């Protein structure tokens, strides 16, 4: 189960920020 | 026209009337106080002579008289230092034993237990150990007794008296007209030839006739009582011949260009006297003679009353090229109609010179028994760096004051000053960038290193044992200066400084000076200096270039030099004034110089200073920990601040206890400053309202209505206590540490 750390920590570190900042950027610039 | 003495007689009648009329000098202040803001404004405007009167002649007279005043207080101070040397010191004991006895010229009175501060300083004397280097100055002067200091002190009090009289006389009695003041060519001639040239020739005289002989005998181990008085070397030539055979030749070799006949008392030795670890008096003699000649020649450049010579206006006007339009045309008018333009220049370059002096005096210790007095070395370096940094920021302030008050568009159209104003966005944008680049690629390397060390990855660090950043250029220059004697300086025996290379020179057991090797820690700290200087310049240059206007406030010149803002509009215009850029530049000057004196302190203690074994092995004060520690912030926190603060914090119940108290006191004054800097007037005026209510309630409400400090004064008080507290802390730190280990 320890292997989940190798999946989740990179996701919370990179995937989640990129996805969140990408969406929020597109939302705050929507006209 | 011709330079001539032209003065008005009895321009200002002397009377105590105006002494009894506080704020007489300003029309607004003359009406009297209504609020407590008046009391501050009185002191704030006191020496702002441009606001007293419009007349440039009256301003010039006030400035000339004030200077005699400042010369008088400086002479009183220098006379006091020498008097305290004559009366309340162990100077004579220290002459007999320079290496063992500790210089002290301040004795404390026995009251409330403060006599503890009178520590055992050697020479059967109890007092505060002095770090001003006065003993090394007086030894260099060839002063060998207390009577010579008494004479010099009294002489000073008479000179201070003369300076007071001069200032009163040249204001109240015979005040020069504006014509006199604007003879810049005559002033430069007299100040280059007499003040500097004849001063240097005069001093060469003293060195050659008094200092060099007396110091030579003291270095030969002759007892102070056995050494002849300085006049006996003039009256009895035989004594002087015995030390310097070249005097046998007399003055004929000078007039017949047979100057080699003086090669024994006018030398180009280089390095340091091995007895004292200071520069050779004979090198210093030849320096001051050579300086004197170059100055006396230099000060025949400017045309006065005989056609021969340059006019500075014509020189300036002729220096223009295809990038700079009219070039330096109109700058002569700026520098001869604005006192602020002269004060800007003179503060900028005297400040820059004082920092050069700091560097040149540690690397080439000019006084006998200075190099080994590690307390004096650290303190005079730090002192002169600080004075330098304040003077430079003053330069920028008065440059901004000139731009707001004294700048004329008509005089300065398409000249270098006009054209810098026209690309000021390009200047500040590029300087902004280089500041961020230097910040990232200097400080970011420390953060990289801290993180790598913390993650247990020393191989990934920027260090000598990891990813190296060798300062190859500084390393190459050190080599060139080390190879200079015999090569590109054939008639030099040693290098100018052992800092560049050559051998470890040691006096007593201790290292006077040795080569200061540069590596990754020296590359990193040099790029921190570059960073912190470029950011200070960004702030100050932005202050001067945007003093008159910006894209935000077009009419900023109308608001003046010192105004708090132009209100919360345009998003908020807090600290747009040239004054507020000086305010912010002071913090960055403080930040910059703090890291300079910390760099000096740690590098010297780890890599230069220390004891020397009979075999010749150098054991440094902090055992060369700089290379591996000074490459992380944690290393600075631990191995510098934490480690070396042990002496100041453990000083209570000893002669250094005062530094322990100053250390806390200074930490307090610093923290107190944050009240003024972080808060605003609005809060304090509303608090004063409630306090005024209570005073009204008991019928003790003052007629002079209490007001919270002005927005500008809040900031002025803030930065004042911040600098005082911060600098005083380091002062107490440096002393307590270096008076224990050094």
């Amino acid at each position: 189960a320890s292997f989940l750390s190798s999946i989740f920590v990179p996701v919370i570190g990179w995937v989640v920020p990129i996805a969140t900042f990408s969406f929020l950027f597109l939302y705050i610039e929507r006209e | 026209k011709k330079a001539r003495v032209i003065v008005d007689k009895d321009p200002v009648p002397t009377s105590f009337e105006k002494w009894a009329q506080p704020g007489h000098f300003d029309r607004t202040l003359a009406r009297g106080p209504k609020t407590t803001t008046w009391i501050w404004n009185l002191h704030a405007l006191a020496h702002d002579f441009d606001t007293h009167t419009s007349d440039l002649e009256d301003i010039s007279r006030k400035i000339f008289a004030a200077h005699f005043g400042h010369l008088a207080v400086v002479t009183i101070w220098l006379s006091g230092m020498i008097f305290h040397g004559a009366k309340f010191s162990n100077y004579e004991a220290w002459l007999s034993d320079p290496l063992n006895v500790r210089p002290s010229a301040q004795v404390v009175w026995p009251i409330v237990g403060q006599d503890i501060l009178n520590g055992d300083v050697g020479g059967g004397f109890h007092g505060i150990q002095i770090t001003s280097g006065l003993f090394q100055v007086w030894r260099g002067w060839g002063i060998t007794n207390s009577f010579q200091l008494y004479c010099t002190a009294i002489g000073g009090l008479v000179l201070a008296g003369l300076f007071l009289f001069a200032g009163w006389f040249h204001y109240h009695k015979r005040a020069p007209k504006l014509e006199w003041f604007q003879n810049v060519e005559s002033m430069l001639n007299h100040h280059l030839q007499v003040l500097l040239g004849c001063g240097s020739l005069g001093w060469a005289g003293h060195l050659i006739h008094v200092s060099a002989p007396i110091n030579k005998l003291m270095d030969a181990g002759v007892a102070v009582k056995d050494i002849p008085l300085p006049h006996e070397f003039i009256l009895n030539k035989s004594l002087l011949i015995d030390l310097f055979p070249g005097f046998a030749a007399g003055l004929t070799p000078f007039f017949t260009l047979n100057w080699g006949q003086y090669a024994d008392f006018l030398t180009f030795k280089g390095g340091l006297n091995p007895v004292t670890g200071g520069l050779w008096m004979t090198d210093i003699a030849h320096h001051h003679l050579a300086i004197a000649v170059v100055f006396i020649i230099a000060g025949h450049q400017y045309r006065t009353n005989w056609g021969i010579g340059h006019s500075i206006k014509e020189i300036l006007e002729n220096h223009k090229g295809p990038f700079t339009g009219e070039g330096h045309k109109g700058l002569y008018e700026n520098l001869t109609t604005s006192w602020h333009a002269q004060l800007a220049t003179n503060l900028a370059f005297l400040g820059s010179l004082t920092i050069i002096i700091a560097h040149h005096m540690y690397a080439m210790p000019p006084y006998p028994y200075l190099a080994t007095d590690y307390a004096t070395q650290l303190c005079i370096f730090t002192h002169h760096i600080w004075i330098g940094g304040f003077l430079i920021v003053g330069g920028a302030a008065h440059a901004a004051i000139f731009m707001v008050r004294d700048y004329d568009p008509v005089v300065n159209q398409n000249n270098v000053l006009d054209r810098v104003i026209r690309h000021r966005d390009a200047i500040i944008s590029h300087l902004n960038w280089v500041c961020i680049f230097l910040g990232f690629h200097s400080f970011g390397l420390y953060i990289h290193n801290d993180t790598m060390r913390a993650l247990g990855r020393p191989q990934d660090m920027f260090s000598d044992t990891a990813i190296q950043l060798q300062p190859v250029f500084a390393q190459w220059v050190q080599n060139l200066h080390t190879l200079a004697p015999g090569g590109t300086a054939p008639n030099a025996l040693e290098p100018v400084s052992y800092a560049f290379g050559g051998g470890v020179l040691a006096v007593g057991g201790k290292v006077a000076m040795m080569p200061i090797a540069l590596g990754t820690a020296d590359f990193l700290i040099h790029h921190i200096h570059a960073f912190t200087i470029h950011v200070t310049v960004l702030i100050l240059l932005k202050g001067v270039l945007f003093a008159r206007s910006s894209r935000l406030i077009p009419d900023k010149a109308n608001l003046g030099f010192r105004f708090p803002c132009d209100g919360p509009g345009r998003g908020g215009t807090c600290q747009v004034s040239g004054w507020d850029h000086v305010f912010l530049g002071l913090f960055w000057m403080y930040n910059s110089l703090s890291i300079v004196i910390f760099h000096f302190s740690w590098k010297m203690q780890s890599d230069v200073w220390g004891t020397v074994d009979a075999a010749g092995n150098v054991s440094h004060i902090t055992g060369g920990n700089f290379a591996q520690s000074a490459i992380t912030i944690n290393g600075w926190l631990r191995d510098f601040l934490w480690a070396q603060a042990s002496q100041v914090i453990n000083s209570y119940g000893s002669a250094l206890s005062a530094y322990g108290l100053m250390f806390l006191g200074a930490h307090f004054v610093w923290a107190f400053s944050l009240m003024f800097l972080f808060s605003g007037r609005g809060y304090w005026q509303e608090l004063i309202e409630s306090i005024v209510w209570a005073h009204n309630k008991l019928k003790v409400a003052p007629a002079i209505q209490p007001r919270a400090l002005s927005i500008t004064q809040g900031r002025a008080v803030g930065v004042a206590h911040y600098l005082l507290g911060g600098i005083a802390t380091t002062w107490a730190f440096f002393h307590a540490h270096i008076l224990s280990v050094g």
């Binding site: 990129i18 990408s22 950027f25 597109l26 610039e29 929507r30 006209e31 | 090229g321 295809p322 990038f323 700079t324 339009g325 054209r419 026209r422 690309h423 966005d425 390009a426 990855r457 191989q459 990934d460 990813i467 015999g486 090569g487």
Partner: protein
């Protein structure tokens, strides 16, 4: 002419051919005088006991390497060859001196241009053929001079060799192009052309140089300069001077490097130990030659820059009174016109970058930009990464690069998504074919493909460095 002051007095006869000629023959004479007179000056104070390198004799080393009166172990046994050479120059100086003073003031101010033989020597700075023929004519004499060194090295005695410390005759010159030109490509050492370690490559080098110079000699006299040369170069008389100064500066630095590192063509028995060496306090001949000609190369580069920038200012129709800093024809606009932002070089370069270059599709712009950025971005990741000192340094670096380029691809998609909002075109200096949502998608597709490719290509070159 008359606008130039006495300080710039030699600029008065730029357009006057006779004075300019007379000046060149006169200065030639001055170089010959020095070469000849200083050879005698050095002969007069040669102590055969002490070595040459720590006496301060510079020309005798140059005569020594050619093998003029030397026995075994680089020992100067006879000095008659130094004297005959010294006097030959020193007399040639007096002949060239005469020629100098004649063409200066006694001769005509302008060399006449006509169909007669005296007409041939006459020239104009605009007629490009005549200068090209002069280039070729003097190139034949550079070739001739290189073949005279070869003839000295092969037939007339030979050259001194530091391997055996004797004056061996050369028989088998290296006529291999791959070997001789390999020096230009840094094949046989890091030092390049200054990495020669035998006379066989030196003679071989001067064969190749000899035939190239003679080959170029025939080319330039029989051909006029083509339309591509007609556009890229400046054609004022000061433009040619600035080019020649760039060459002299390059040659000065070349020889300064040669003498510093090379010991074959500069023997240690004559010039002294390699690098910068001082024996018994005395600075070696090598150090003097190296450091002087290094300093003169920096000066002659400063000469190229000065004369080249002056040409570029004059040809732009700008004077030095109004200057090189102007306004944008609308003074109240932000920017100023400067040689950094408005120079034809700057404008031509920027316009021709893939982002601005006409006739590139949105994809092709992205692709070229991608390839460039993807290529250089590999370096930092490979060489400074955490796995830089492992077997996975290149592979780690490549995956990092692809990684960064994928986030940069998202950044592009975000930038486009933000701006392209139904009709409203993006602000900023875009090309006309990147002002639609589909064109921006193509540009992003271009960037991705380009950047991945650029990274992959750099990786294939890095991993196959063998």
């Amino acid at each position: 002419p008359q606008q130039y002051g006495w300080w710039a007095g030699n600029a008065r006869f730029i357009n006057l051919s006779g004075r300019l000629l007379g000046a060149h023959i006169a200065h030639a004479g001055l170089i010959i005088l020095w070469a000849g007179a200083m050879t005698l000056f050095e002969i007069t104070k040669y102590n055969p006991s002490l070595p040459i390198y720590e006496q301060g004799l510079i020309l005798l080393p140059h005569l020594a390497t050619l093998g003029f009166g030397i026995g075994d172990g680089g020992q100067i046994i006879d000095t008659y060859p130094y004297f005959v050479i010294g006097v030959v120059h020193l007399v040639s100086s007096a002949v060239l001196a005469a020629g100098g003073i004649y063409h200066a003031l006694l001769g005509p101010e302008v060399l006449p241009e006509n169909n007669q033989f005296p007409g041939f020597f006459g020239y104009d700075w605009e007629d490009e053929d005549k200068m090209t023929t002069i280039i070729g004519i003097h190139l034949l004499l550079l070739g001739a001079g290189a073949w005279l060194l070869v003839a000295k090295a092969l037939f007339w005695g030979g050259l001194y060799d530091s391997t055996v410390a004797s004056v061996r005759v050369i028989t088998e010159p290296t006529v291999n192009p791959a070997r001789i030109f390999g020096y230009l490509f840094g094949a046989f050492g890091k030092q390049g052309m200054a990495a020669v370690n035998n006379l066989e490559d030196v003679v071989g080098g001067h064969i190749w140089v000899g035939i190239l110079c003679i080959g170029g000699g025939f080319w330039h006299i029989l051909t006029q300069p083509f339309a591509w040369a007609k556009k890229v170069l400046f054609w004022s008389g000061e433009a040619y001077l600035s080019y020649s100064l760039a060459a002299l500066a390059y040659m000065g630095l070349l020889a300064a490097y040669f003498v510093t590192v090379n010991d074959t063509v500069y023997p240690t028995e004559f010039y002294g130990p390699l690098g910068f060496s001082s024996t018994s306090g005395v600075i070696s001949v090598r150090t003097w030659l190296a450091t002087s000609h290094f300093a003169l190369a920096i000066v002659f580069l400063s000469g190229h820059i000065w004369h080249a920038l002056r040409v570029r200012v004059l040809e732009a129709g700008l004077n030095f009174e109004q200057g090189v800093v102007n306004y944008l024809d609308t003074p109240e606009l932000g920017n100023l016109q400067t040689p950094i932002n408005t120079s034809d070089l700057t404008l031509k370069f920027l316009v021709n970058l893939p982002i601005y270059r006409p006739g590139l599709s949105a994809f092709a712009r992205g692709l070229e930009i991608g390839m460039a950025h993807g290529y250089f971005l590999l370096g930092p990741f490979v060489k400074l990464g955490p796995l830089r000192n492992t077997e996975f340094a290149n592979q780690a670096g490549l995956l990092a690069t692809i990684g960064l380029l994928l986030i940069l691809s998202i950044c592009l998609w975000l930038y486009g998504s933000a701006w392209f909002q139904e009709g409203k075109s993006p602000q900023g200096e875009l090309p006309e074919n990147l002002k639609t949502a589909k064109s921006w998608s193509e540009f992003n597709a271009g960037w991705i493909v380009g950047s991945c490719g650029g990274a992959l290509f750099a990786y294939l070159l890095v991993t196959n460095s063998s």
